[PDB]
Structure formats: structure tokens, C-alpha cells
Specification:
CATH architecture of the largest domain: Sandwich
CATH class of the largest domain: Mainly Beta
Membrane topology: Lipid-anchor
Number of helices: 1
CATH topology of the largest domain: Immunoglobulin-like
Protein name: Factor H binding protein
Family: Belongs to the factor H binding-protein family.
Oligomer: monomer
Shape: globular
Keywords: Cell outer membrane, Lipoprotein, Membrane, Palmitate, Secreted, Signal, Virulence
Strand content: over 45%
Number of domains: 2
Order of helices and strands: HEEEEEEEEEEEEEEEE
Radius of gyration: 18 Å
Main location: membrane
Helix content: under 10%
Number of strands: 16
Amino acid sequence: GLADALTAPLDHKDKGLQSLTLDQSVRKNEKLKLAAQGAEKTYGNGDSLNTGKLKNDKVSRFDFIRQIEVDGQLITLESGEFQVYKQSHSALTAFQTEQIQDSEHSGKMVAKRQFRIGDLGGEHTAFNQLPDGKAEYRGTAFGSDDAGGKLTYTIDFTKKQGNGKIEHLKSPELNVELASAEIKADGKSHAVILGDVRYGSEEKGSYSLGIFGGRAQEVAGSAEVKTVNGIRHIGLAAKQL
């Protein structure tokens, strides 16, 4: 499904989420080239990724090159692995950097590793159309070199509160509690949750989730965990059973 995501047109026959707009994953004035399984495609800011072709509830992986066109020619600025986690009403992306442009010689690349979240999108649940009871979510938490995290989350729509936890990441300090937090209305009037992240009794950062699907089937977003090495980013996506 990787080559097809790069070569085939959007087809509503494929399982949703059908597509994802790459607003954050491609910066204005730059281009993003993805390659996998013998195919490639280049994206500009605002283009859509064909997530329809990707498998649900798993991380799909592409090689990426972030490029800039300067007076006709394409210069590589960064390369590595582009990750996409697909659910039915939501999706998110992330970047594992492996190389960056040398700071002095534009034509040279230098080994360098780092990790960051890209886009989060899908069919946002309207704040004023939230369901009634309580809901349980289960899914994935993924960070640099580790897609084996397990996300547990619970929403009480009556109290408009959510809370949960991350387990099983290889780095134990990343297995944090996602502390109780209020469901609020976005600037786009979408339902969102912003909360603290905790380990033991202590605050360790923050998390941010959007609620997706007509019936709040899904949550997705990310967490930042403060560490002595220092901030670690974790992608988050879960769904009702």
C-alpha cells in the first residue's frame, strides 16, 4: 500500500481516513519528497496525502527528503523517515531525521537524529455535537525508534473530562499518566483536550488531543515529556472498541 499511496489517485472505495492535508509536514517555500517500495511523490504545503491506501492502526513508513528549489535547482535540506499513523476518522504524521544539510557547505549532508510531530487531522468532532455518556479508547503511542507504546484513554462526556495513560514504551520515563483534563472548544469549535502529563506525583509536561468522528470514536494528538535530554515528543492515537 506504500507505493500506491504515492502513485494512485484518491479513491473513496479505500478504507478511511481517506486523506490528510499536509499543512505542517511541508513548509511554505519548501517541498517534501516521499519514497517507498520503488515509487516517489513530491508534496507542497497544503497538498493531500493519500492515507486511504495505508493500513489502519499501524505506522506506515516512507523515506523523505525535504528540499528547497533555488533558482531552478533542488537542494536537499534534510532526510530520514516519515511516519504516518492512520485511523478511521483521524491521522497524524511524524519525522525521524537521519541527515541534515551541513551548516557550511550546502552540498554536504551530515548524520543527525531527531524526532518531531507533523500533521494531525481528520473529521473533527464538533464541540456542540458531543455524545452523552462515557467512552473508552485504546491505541498507540509512538516516539523516536519506538512504535510499541500503548495508549489508554477515557472520556466522561457528562463531566466533559478526560484522562488516561501511556504504557510499554522502551524508555520508561515516557510511560506517563495523561492527567484529568477538560474538554473545550477550539477556535474552529472542534472538541479538544489539553492537559498535564505526570510520572508518579510529579508534572512532566503536557498532552494535547483532538476528538474525532461523529460519535467521538477517536482521539489523536501528541504529548511532550520533559527529560534531562530534554523534550521528548510522542504521537498519540486511539479509538473505541
